[PDB]
Amino acid sequence: DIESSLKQLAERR
Amino acid sequence: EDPSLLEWDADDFRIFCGDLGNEVNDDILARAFSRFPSFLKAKVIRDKRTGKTKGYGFVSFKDPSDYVRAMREMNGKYVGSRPIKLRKSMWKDRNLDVVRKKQKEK
Amino acid sequence: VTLGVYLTKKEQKKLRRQTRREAQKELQEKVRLGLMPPPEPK
Amino acid sequence: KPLPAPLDGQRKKRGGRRYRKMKERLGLTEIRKQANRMSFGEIEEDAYQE
Amino acid sequence: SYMLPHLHNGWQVDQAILSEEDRVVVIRFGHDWDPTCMKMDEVLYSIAEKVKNFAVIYLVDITEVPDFNKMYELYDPCTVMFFFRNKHIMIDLGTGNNNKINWAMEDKQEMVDIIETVYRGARKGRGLVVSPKDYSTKYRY
RNA sequence: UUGGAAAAGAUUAGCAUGGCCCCUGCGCAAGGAUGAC
RNA sequence: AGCUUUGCGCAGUGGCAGUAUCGUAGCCAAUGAGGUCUAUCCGAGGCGCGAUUUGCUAAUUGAAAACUUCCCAAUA
């Protein structure tokens, strides 16, 4: 859910 | 005179369908199926030789109770570009004006 | 057998209010739909 | 903590001993005079009384 | 975080605009990497549970679905735009145009008031809702 | 009778309805008092 | 046989209407919520939510404030 999107955003920043 | 109600005298339940958009519900104003005859013998009145609708349009349902229930359930519901409401029709020609004058001051 | 019980005063007031409102609504629905004109409100 | 919908009143048709009591007790009518006039010609109060 | 579900597919976003009609649909075209879009997402989360009963806010990534940034020309790092029943309402911010907010609004009350005014204007049908704010200036002193 | 051009319904106020408190006529429960050569 | 008690529901009348009327949906509550009298006495409400709903008429502003065509010209 939101965990995957949050991890994706974090990995790029 | 206006020979218009001759095609709508059916002792039905007539309501005022107006304050809508000029083009909103131009031809499908009676397409709704809230009752059996929908707005039977009813359409949207317009200003002739101008391509524009003058607001109020005919809304006549042949079933009184069904008309009341639909109007209560669909008062101001989303209708095209301008959600319009329903209210009781006037149907007050001079045959009503004479009786009103007789019964008012006497 | 088929027997009843007592009621409540607050329930009595709620029932009276709801019954008056329902009677008014039923009269309005029956006489305003277009089947029989209602009398003048007195 | 919901937020009320952006809706207002439909229309006004009642008044007098049905809605006038609230508009006379709660929203009571004020003086509505001697407190809204300015008298653009003269000056009643001092220059900086405020 | 970003509890608001971002519509990854462009056609999905368009259908979401056509999904709700009785409320306000706000799409955040900002890219989630930039801090400005992070502040916009925080402001949305502040009004996430407030304007929910009157609006449905969705996020968006211009990199994921580029058609929105190429047709509507949303070139700002984080531009907030509105669409109500297939009608992109315009907020009279006074910044020359009215298609986007383009500012990282750090005030939750201002965003809530703007959302309420946009909803009122959409109900009234005004395509250019008069924003109750002096957005033409920095509003700072 | 004949003849040529053709606010997306709002503001303001009263009246009754409506809400309750009282009575009345109606309908009737369980009872209460009485007349019954 | 006539009347009547708790009175009920209908219909009419009188009055009240922000403190009030009610739902009260959150909570306690006939298995007692509350105390200067009465304390070995009294015994059913209180805390918070929200409104006072149904229609008609006049007026009022506006160019138009709405219910099935219209401004025009010698006549009939």
Q: Is the CB of residue E110 less than 8 Å from the CB of residue E43?
A: no
Report yes or no on E67 lying in a domain.
yes
Instruction: Give the domain range for residue E48.
Output: 2-136
Q: Kindly state the DSSP code that residue E5 receives in the 8-state scheme.
A: P
Give residues 114 to 133 of E whose Cβ lies within 8 Å of D: 116, 119-120, 123
- Chain B partners of C29 at a C-beta cutoff of 8 Å? 65, 68
Report yes or no on E102 lying in a domain.
yes
E24-43: b (≥16 Cβ within 10 Å) or e: bbbbbbbbbbeebbbebbeb
Entry resolution (Å):
4.1
Question: Quick one: CA torsion of E44, E48, E54, E55, rounded to 10 degrees?
Answer: 50
| Closest alpha carbon to B18 in B90, B83, B92 | B83
D8-35: b (≥16 Cβ within 10 Å) or e: eeeeeeeeeeeeeeeeeeeeeeeeeeee
Q: What are chain A's partners, defined as 3 or more CB pairs within 8 angstroms?
A: E
Q: Residue C7 CA to G1 C1' — how many Å?
A: 35
Element (H, E) at E56: strand E55-59
Report yes or no on E9 lying in a domain.
yes
| Closest alpha carbon to B17 in B64, B67, B65 | B67
User: Which CATH number does the domain housing residue E83 bear?
Assistant: 3.40.30.10
Tally of structural domains, chain E? 1
Report yes or no on E130 lying in a domain.
yes
Is the CB of B68 inside 8 Å of chain C's CB atoms?
yes
Report yes or no on E114 lying in a domain.
yes
Interrupted after residues, chain E (C–N over 2.5 Å) = none
Q: Is the CB of residue B61 less than 8 Å from the CB of residue B67?
A: yes
Q: How far apart are CA E96 and CA E126, in angstroms?
A: 18
Q: Residue B24 CA to F5 C1' — how many Å?
A: 29
Q: Is the CB of residue E23 less than 8 Å from the CB of residue E57?
A: no
Q: Is the CB of residue E81 less than 8 Å from the CB of residue E58?
A: no
Report yes or no on E141 lying in a domain.
no
| Closest alpha carbon to B82 in E123, C5, D24 | E123
Q: How far apart are CA D17 and CA E95, in angstroms?
A: 51
Q: Kindly state the DSSP code that residue E6 receives in the 8-state scheme.
A: P
Instruction: Tell how many helices (H) and how many strands (E) occur in chain D.
Output: 1, 0
Q: Is the CB of residue B72 less than 8 Å from the CB of residue B35?
A: no
E106-124: b (≥16 Cβ within 10 Å) or e: eeeebbbebbbbbbbbbbe
Report yes or no on E19 lying in a domain.
yes
CB-based contacts of E63: which residues, under 8 Å, 6+ apart? Answer: E31
Q: Is the CB of residue E26 less than 8 Å from the CB of residue E57?
A: yes
C-alpha triplet E121, E123, E129: angle, nearest 5°: 10
Question: CB-hemisphere CA count at 13 Å for E4?
Answer: 32
CB contact under 8 A, E50 and D5: no
Q: What percent of the residues of chain E are helix, what percent strand, and what percent coil, each to the nearest 5? A: 35, 15, 55
Sign of CA dihedral B26, B28, B34, B37: positive
